[PDB]
Design a protein around this ligand. Structure first.
Ligand code: CLA
Ligand code: CLA
Ligand code: CLA
Ligand code: CLA
Ligand code: CLA
Ligand code: CLA
Ligand code: CLA
Ligand SMILES: CCCCCCCCCCCCCCCC(=O)OC[C@H](COP(=O)(O)OC[C@@H](O)CO)OC(=O)CCCCCCCCCCCCCCC
Ligand SMILES: CC(/C=C/C=C(C)/C=C/[C@@]12O[C@]1(C)C[C@@H](O)CC2(C)C)=C\C=C\C=C(C)\C=C\C=C(C)\C=C\[C@@]12O[C@]1(C)C[C@@H](O)CC2(C)C
Ligand SMILES: CC1=C(/C=C/C(C)=C/C=C/C(C)=C/C=C/C=C(C)/C=C/C=C(C)/C=C/C2=C(C)CCCC2(C)C)C(C)(C)CCC1
Ligand SMILES: CC1=C(C/C=C(\C)CCC[C@H](C)CCC[C@H](C)CCCC(C)C)C(=O)c2ccccc2C1=O
Ligand code: SF4
Lengths: 204, 216, 39, 742
């Protein structure tokens, strides 16, 4: 409510208090001005953050070890085009039925916040989350680190969304660098570390 | 004193303006029907800001040319203004970075400073408010956007009282005006002579009759 | 934003978006299954 | 005290009014009761008068709307340069302009439409363009797709800048009324500023980029090996080797030894014989002199100092015994009525475009333009239509001025009043001269057709019978041909190879220009032009002179500018409004321009265009058939329309087939227009009643009650489809023919 803003001296939009984690008053196009949309965009930002972080660590760490020798994992940009134990199109069907189910229940939870906290096969199992986007329970917060004081939950979720935002620019950078340069990300960083003033986005 | 003033320019230029010579043959700072960037408060700021950069430029665009001809900086770093990489077809030089990579660092650093500076013109009380490495203690301005002062911009305490500040503002203004004409001088002398400004100053002493604006 | 969403719903705007989507669909059916005279 | 006067934040920027259709109008804003609402919303969108009566607030709307138009043009030019850069054979065309067909559009492969990608040369497949952009870019010294890419980005930037300015000068800093009325400052800034600094700065490009690069192209060196344009600025010796005047630099300019520049500033005339276009050294010298004239002309009117006139003084000082007070009061009219300004500007801009049509064909200003018969037939026709439309627009806003802005009590003018006091003498005289013209032009054709049908070709108006030689035009032709040695000593050759005399210029075995002969047939078709133009002025001028009143309708001005009629009484008063005169004048403008462009197409194919032999035996496209064929209507039916329509009706199955489809499509739209022009909304409203009943029977009637188009809309819809179908038919007929045989 008196927090640092993405634009010091500017005035934050009325729909952004500071009660949301990662609230820095940035929405110059009013994409979240309607409260119904702002709640949907929070959930969309949360899942974009969590997929980007898994994706970032899934392309930066494995490529970081193959550039050496600890791993031999192929280029992240081409790992999809190679063949596996079954064909790629069977893996995609198994992915949809498995991810669609998990996505379906998350969807139901967004539109009806308490309806899917109970295990449909063994109704003894239950999730523990109170807020949409933080399902809790044993399967997603087995340590109990998700249930804390609202002061710590504000920071912990701000750490969550900040790491997810950075990961989003990073993953999108890894996709763009691989097309403008011609190698992997670990190569780009060393090249820029070999000569910082010249080995950049300029080649001409 | 009035430099080609008129009895309509005197109606709004009340002398309460550092450098108020009454000069306005086109009625630009007329407070009747202002808007956009044609505005009295803003034009004074633009006169000052352009004046300050020209003072850095008029000296810097001739400092390596002067220091080099004497032999004070290496002859491989002493250059004329239009041959340092600013205009690649006229001259380049291998700095520690590419000529375009340097501009990104420039606009990145010049961005932060010029962006924060604009907020003291818009919201005067700002910049000192939002955290900034504790440096925000000397970013609160002064109620004057063009003369913020403080520990960062007036660290020595000049303009101590009334009669000193207005005498300082008046000299600060007239210098930028001549430096701006100097910046204007370096530009046309470059395109018409093809040589540096300090050399143009030289050949007008070695032969004033045959080295002139009329010979080119 | 709600004013913008109202404008985006006005007859001409909703028509181009609807017919654009339609044209794209029919074009791609014709790129995938061209020259269909029967059925 | 001419100064910048602006108001701060007049109109708040908000999407609130985007959500409210018809907000600008108090009637329309309440929402639709009927479908008629939908149409009035659009008919009234730009009628800024009906939105607000405040002249200041009207001017602000037209100012930002102008920025809107400029934004659209820059975006249009961005795409033209972008397609030249990305989807063209311009780079290949530079190596072989006599053979490779300009192409800058490529169709995606879908539903069989690839056939429109034609074998145009240069290893390219695309649609042959006739806008002429390739001849422009070459004359500008553009040598690569990279240069077009950068011009397209700059055009895109200017499009954004112009759009920003429109929003800026309406919502942020909107000029006050008196700022717009400072017509002295505007004229000075447009003469000296726009026209002057535009022609001067463009002359600089011609000197430092266009002249040198075209010298390498014409010498034969490959464009990839021609020095980049900035090398002629960085290194003067490159220039000096082509034109040794640059060796002395800007010194001969200030020492009045201008004759030293006679190698890149010339007065040769004629056409560069190895390129077919005007001499680029004559053109550069043209823009130079033209730029001087405008820079000084922009100093004529008085502003913030003493020198110069007040435009009111010049007007108030011209008046004669036959006119009385003369031009007094015109300065108040032309500083308070936007329609009076728009009427004059449309009149002149339209007239000027028709001149551009003539001058650009007889003095081809671009290299390898004259031999691209398809581009040149397109350019002349395109600018005729644009010119004729703008002219008819002048009559509308002249008519709109008389209904809405004319006020003899506040802004009197004795010149305007004197014409109103004898409008019956003007219109009756124009009526008679039209009847004379029609009989003594078209009637001669009917004489010829009847004589030729009866087996009596000796009694025709023909070059081989009763001859009607255009002595005066023939005389002017023979005069200009003798000007370079006599009345224009500095001129080497005539200003145009059309000037009856000289010789011939060919490019790649194709004739560019020769002397154009003017005989009996040229006499007839010229008196058709005078006839058709006279009737167009008769209808339009009558519409403005009786816009306020007539013996039939004494209070017509109270019925507005645009109204269907005043009912069946007085024997019937349909189409008394000035708007209806503009409706009728469009059909006649269409008529007049159609035979003008037909006159152009047949003459060029018959007596000018064609292929030259090894020894000089010219074979024209239609072999001189214009003289004996174009003097009967049957000759135009048979030897022009029936014969030249061959290409378009056999274009199916080839890359020209899209003209085949457009030929038939435009016939359709033209015939479709007749439904509107021949019927009346009463029939249609009753029909709709039976249809509405059927919808009610199934509970599907709309709350927006369906109405027939208004009487005026019916007419507007009619003339719009009539002109679109009519003109598009000739478009598809011209392009198919000229691309197949040119
Ligand atoms: C016969 C029709 C039918 C259809 C089309 C579906 C379709 C669906 N059910 Mg459902 N269901 C049905 C009958 C049906 N069910 C019956 C008869 C029962 C027993 C009462 C259930 C009990 C059930 C549970 C318990 C759940 C679903 C879920 C789902 C969704 C899984 C998403 C996915 O991709 O998984 C691959 C999907 C939309 C899941 C879901 O996403 O719900 C939000 C879920 O959790 N269904
Ligand atoms: C740095 C990023 C980051 C941060 C700070 C958090 C923080 C949080 N998450 Mg989150 N999450 C993230 C990334 C992150 N997550 C990613 C990438 C995913 C996708 C897999 C998820 C999926 C997820 C779910 C499904 C749930 C949470 C929950 C929580 C909350 C309690 C759990 C906790 O304390 O995590 C602490 C996290 C760390 C200390 C980071 C450890 C990182 C390394 C890689 C350990 C992983 C090891 C692995 C086996 C390899 C807390 C607000 C739960 C919640 O709110 O319950 C109420 C909950 O239900 N998150
Ligand atoms: C014909 C078009 C047109 C006209 C008549 C005006 C008229 C006006 N504008 Mg405006 N404007 C235009 C286009 C136009 N503008 C465009 C395209 C933009 C977008 C960039 C703007 C952006 C703009 C702003 C932001 C402001 C105005 C302002 C003004 C007012 C004072 C201008 C003045 O003399 O300030 C003095 C002019 C200058 C100090 C500029 C001098 C140097 C610039 C760069 C001019 C160079 C242009 C030149 C022809 C280009 C040559 C390029 C070539 C060498 C390659 C006046 C009513 C001002 C206002 O509101 O006044 C009340 C104001 O604040 N305009
Ligand atoms: C804001 C004004 C300004 C700007 C943008 C520049 C810009 C530049 N100066 Mg410079 N300079 C300036 C004012 C300025 N000067 C003034 C006022 C002085 C005198 C105190 C100098 C004295 C100076 C020297 C002695 C040298 C530069 C050099 C340079 C270049 C490299 C900068 C670098 O490495 O750090 C660059 C073109 C270097 C260079 O290569 O010269 C062009 C160099 O050796 N400058
Ligand atoms: C007068 C301007 C003009 C015109 C008539 C064309 C025409 C054409 N261009 Mg071209 N182009 C232009 C300017 C223009 N261009 C400019 C300025 C650029 C540079 C940015 C390009 C860059 C360009 C490329 C890169 C390509 C074309 C292509 C094409 C062809 C197919 C385009 C197509 O089907 O799009 C597809 C249709 C759509 C995208 C329309 C979507 C419908 C939506 C719903 C309408 C939205 C309406 C909305 C309310 C208003 C939005 C406004 C918004 C912009 C602010 C077509 C002949 C293509 C081509 O030639 O392929 C061989 C091609 O690949 N053009
Ligand atoms: C610079 C040129 C110019 C300008 C600024 C104006 C401006 C104006 N004219 Mg004017 N006019 C012009 C040229 C111009 N005209 C010309 C050249 C003609 C001769 C044709 C006319 C004939 C004319 C008449 C007869 C009338 C006006 C009217 C008006 C006013 C209202 C316009 C409006 O709201 O229309 C809104 C615009 C439309 C509804 C567009 C309709 C669509 C057009 C007709 C079809 C275009 C077809 C297109 C080229 C081909 C694409 C086909 C494709 C879609 C399949 C406005 C002041 C009206 C008035 O009452 O003034 C007060 C009026 O009745 N004008
Ligand atoms: C081909 C069809 C056609 C013809 C012949 C005419 C003819 C005429 N129109 Mg017209 N018009 C037409 C279509 C046509 N229109 C259409 C489609 C429209 C709708 C847009 C209009 C709208 C229109 C308007 C709005 C105006 C005209 C005007 C005119 C007259 C022009 C003056 C003139 O040349 O008189 C001379 C007549 C002719 C050249 C016709 C041919 C005469 C023949 C060749 C001579 C016959 C000799 C002798 C009588 C033999 C017969 C003997 C017999 C009795 C036994 C003229 C009577 C204008 C007018 O009245 O100005 C005076 C006028 O203002 N028309
Ligand atoms: C045509 C000869 C001509 O130019 O006359 C010019 C004649 C002389 O005009 P005044 O000398 O009255 O005009 C003075 C000013 O009003 C025009 O500068 O004007 C008329 O009376 C117009 C006659 C129209 C007659 C149409 C026939
Ligand atoms: C960054 C992007 C979102 C950026 C959107 C931001 C900027 C929008 C900003 C604004 O809207 C605001 C906020 C407010 C408005 O007023 C203004 C604008 C400016 C409009 C999301 C990317 C989201 C990117 C995420 C979702 C991608 C996750 C990808 C994972 C699955 C990849 C897995 C793999 O990479 C591995 C691990 C190994 C490989 O070998 C194989 C594969 C499969 C490739
Ligand atoms: C094509 C195109 C484009 C481009 C354009 C351009 C490129 C332009 C340029 C332009 C230019 C670049 C211009 C320039 C100008 C200049 C000028 C105009 C100058 C003037 C001068 C003067 C006036 C002078 C004066 C003087 C005198 C008189 C004497 C002595 C002294 C002096 C010299 C000072 C665009 C993108 C837009 C768009 C699209 C198309
Ligand atoms: C044929 C015509 C009729 C009827 C034609 C009118 C009613 C035009 C109908 C225009 C459209 C087609 C009406 C429907 C418009 C809706 C936007 C359609 C929505 C459906 C979607 C496909 C967009 C009259 O109005 C009449 C007017 C006076 C002189 C003669 C004419 C004329 O001859
Ligand atoms: S027919 Fe139509 S236009 Fe002619 S009078 Fe009757 S209503 Fe008015």
């Amino acid at each position: 409510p008196d927090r640092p803003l993405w634009f010091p001296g500017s005035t934050p939009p009325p729909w952004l208090d500071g009660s949301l984690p990662g609230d820095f008053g940035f929405d110059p196009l009013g994409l979240g001005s309607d409260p119904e949309s702002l709640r949907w965009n929070v959930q969309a930002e949360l899942v974009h953050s969590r997929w980007a972080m898994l994706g970032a660590a899934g392309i930066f760490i494995p490529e970081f070890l193959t550039k050496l020798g600890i791993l031999n994992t192929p280029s992240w940009y081409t790992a999809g085009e190679q063949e596996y134990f079954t064909d790629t199109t069977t893996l995609f069907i198994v992915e949809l039925v498995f991810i669609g189910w998990a996505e379906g229940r998350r969807w139901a939870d967004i539109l009806n916040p308490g309806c899917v906290n109970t295990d449909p096969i063994f109704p003894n199992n239950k999730l523990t989350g109170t807020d949409v986007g933080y399902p809790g329970g044993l399967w997603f917060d087995p340590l109990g680190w998700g249930s804390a004081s609202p002061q710590k939950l504000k920071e912990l979720r701000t750490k969550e969304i900040k790491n997810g935002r950075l990961a989003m620019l990073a993953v999108m950078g890894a996709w763009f660098q691989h097309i403008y340069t011609g190698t992997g990300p670990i190569d780009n960083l060393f090249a820029h570390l070999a000569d910082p003033g010249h080995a950049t986005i300029f080649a001409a | 004193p009035l430099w080609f003033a008129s009895k309509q320019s005197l109606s709004y230029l009340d002398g309460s303006l550092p450098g108020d010579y009454g000069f306005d043959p086109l009625g630009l700072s007329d407070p009747e029907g202002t808007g956009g960037f044609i505005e009295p408060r803003w034009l004074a700021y633009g006169e000052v800001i352009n004046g300050r950069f020209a003072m850095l430029g008029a000296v810097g665009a001739i400092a390596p040319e002067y220091l080099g001809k004497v032999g004070l900086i290496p002859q491989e770093t002493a250059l004329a203004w239009f041959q340092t990489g600013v205009i690649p077809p006229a001259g380049t030089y291998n700095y520690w970075a590419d000529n375009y990579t340097l501009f990104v660092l420039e606009m990145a650093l010049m961005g932060f400073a010029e962006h924060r500076r604009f907020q003291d013109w818009a919201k005067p009380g700002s910049m000192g408010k939002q955290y900034f490495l504790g440096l925000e203690k000397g970013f609160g301005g002064s109620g004057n956007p063009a003369y913020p002062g403080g520990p960062f911009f007036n660290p020595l305490g000049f303009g101590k009282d009334e009669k000193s500040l207005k005498e300082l503002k008046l000299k600060e203004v007239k210098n930028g005006r001549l430096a701006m004409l100097a910046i204007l001088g370096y530009f046309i002398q470059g395109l018409v002579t093809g040589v540096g400004p300090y050399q143009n100053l030289l050949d007008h002493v070695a032969d004033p009759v045959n080295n002139n604006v009329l010979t080119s | 934003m709600r004013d913008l969403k109202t404008y985006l719903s006005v007859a001409p705007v909703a028509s181009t978006l609807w017919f654009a989507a339609l044209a794209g669909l029919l074009i791609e059916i014709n790129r995938f299954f061209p020259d269909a005279l029967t059925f | 005290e001419v100064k910048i006067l602006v108001d701060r934040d007049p109109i708040k920027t908000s999407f609130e009014q985007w959500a409210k259709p018809g907000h600008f109008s108090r009637t329309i804003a309440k929402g639709p009761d009927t479908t008629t609402w939908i149409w009035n919303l659009h008919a009234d969108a730009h009628d800024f008068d009906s939105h607000t009566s405040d002249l200041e607030e009207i001017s602000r709307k037209v100012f930002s709307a102008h920025f809107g138009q400029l934004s659209i043009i820059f975006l249009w030019l961005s795409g033209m340069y972008f397609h030249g850069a990305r989807f063209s054979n311009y780079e290949a065309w530079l190596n072989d302009p006599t053979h490779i067909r300009p192409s800058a559009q490529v169709v995606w492969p879908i539903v069989g439409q690839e056939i429109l990608n034609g074998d145009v040369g240069g290893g390219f497949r695309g649609i042959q363009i006739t806008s002429g952009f390739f001849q422009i870019w070459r004359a500008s010294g553009i040598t690569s797709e990279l240069q077009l890419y950068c011009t397209a980005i700059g055009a895109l930037v200017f499009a954004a800048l112009m759009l920003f300015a429109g929003w800026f000068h309406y919502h942020k800093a909107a000029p006050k009324l008196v700022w717009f009325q400072d017509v002295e400052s505007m004229l000075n800034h447009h003469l000296a500023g726009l026209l002057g600094l535009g022609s001067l700065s463009w002359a600089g490009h011609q000197i430092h980029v266009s002249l040198p690069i075209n010298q390498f192209l014409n010498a034969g060196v490959d464009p990839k090996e021609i020095p980049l344009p900035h090398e002629f600025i960085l290194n003067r010796d490159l220039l000096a080797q082509l034109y040794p005047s640059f060796a002395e630099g800007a010194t001969p300019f200030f020492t009045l030894n201008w004759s030293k520049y006679a190698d890149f500033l010339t007065f040769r005339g004629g056409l560069d014989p190895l390129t077919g276009g005007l001499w680029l050294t004559d053109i550069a010298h043209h823009h130079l002199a033209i730029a001087i004239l405008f820079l000084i002309a922009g100093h004529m009117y008085r502003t913030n100092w003493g020198i110069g006139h007040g435009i009111k003084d010049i007007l108030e000082a011209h008046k004669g015994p036959f006119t009385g007070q003369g031009h007094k009061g015109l300065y108040e009219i032309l500083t308070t009525s936007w329609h009076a300004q728009l009427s004059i500007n449309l009149a002149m801009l339209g007239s000027l475009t028709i001149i551009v049509a003539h001058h650009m064909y007889a003095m081809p200003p671009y290299p390898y333009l004259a031999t691209d018969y398809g581009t040149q037939l397109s350019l002349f026709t395109h600018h005729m239509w644009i010119g004729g439309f703008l002219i008819v627009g002048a009559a509308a806003h002249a008519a709109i001025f008389m209904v809405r802005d004319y006020d003899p009590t506040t802004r009197y003018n004795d010149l305007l009043d004197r014409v109103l006091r004898h409008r019956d003498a003007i219109i009756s005289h124009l009526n008679w001269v039209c009847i004379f013209l029609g009989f003594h032009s078209f009637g001669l054709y009917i004489h010829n057709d009847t004589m030729s049908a009866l087996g009596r070709p000796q009694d025709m108006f023909s070059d081989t019978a009763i001859q009607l030689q255009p002595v005066f035009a023939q005389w002017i032709q023979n005069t200009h041909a003798l000007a370079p040695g006599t009345t224009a000593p500095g001129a080497t050759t005539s200003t145009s190879l059309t000037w009856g005399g000289g010789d011939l210029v060919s490019v790649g075995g194709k004739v560019a220009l020769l002397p154009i002969p003017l005989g009996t047939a040229d006499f007839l078709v010229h008196h058709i032009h005078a006839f058709t133009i006279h009737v167009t002025v008769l209808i339009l001028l009558k519409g403005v002179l009786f816009a306020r009143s007539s013996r039939l309708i004494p209070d017509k001005a109270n019925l507005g500018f645009r109204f269907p009629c005043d009912g069946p009484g007085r024997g019937g008063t349909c189409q008394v409004s000035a708007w209806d005169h503009v409706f009728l004048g469009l059909f006649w403008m269409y008529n007049a321009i159609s035979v003008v462009i037909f006159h152009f197409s047949w003459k060029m194919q018959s007596d000018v265009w064609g292929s030259i032999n090894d020894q000089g035996v010219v074979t024209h496209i239609t072999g001189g058939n214009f003289a004996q064929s174009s003097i009967t209507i049957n000759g135009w039916l048979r030897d022009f329309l029936w014969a030249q329509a061959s290409q378009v009706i056999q274009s199916y199955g080839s890359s020209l087939s899209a003209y085949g489809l457009f030929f038939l499509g435009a016939h359709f739209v033209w015939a479709f227009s007749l439904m509107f022009l021949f019927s009346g909304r009463g029939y249609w409203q009753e029909l709709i009643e039976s249809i509405v009943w059927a919808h009610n029977k199934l509970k599907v009637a709309p709350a927006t009650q369906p109405r027939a188009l208004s009487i005026v809309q019916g007419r507007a819809v009619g003339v719009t489809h009539y002109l679109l179908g009519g003109i598009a038919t000739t478009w598809a007929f011209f392009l198919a023919r000229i691309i197949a045989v040119g």
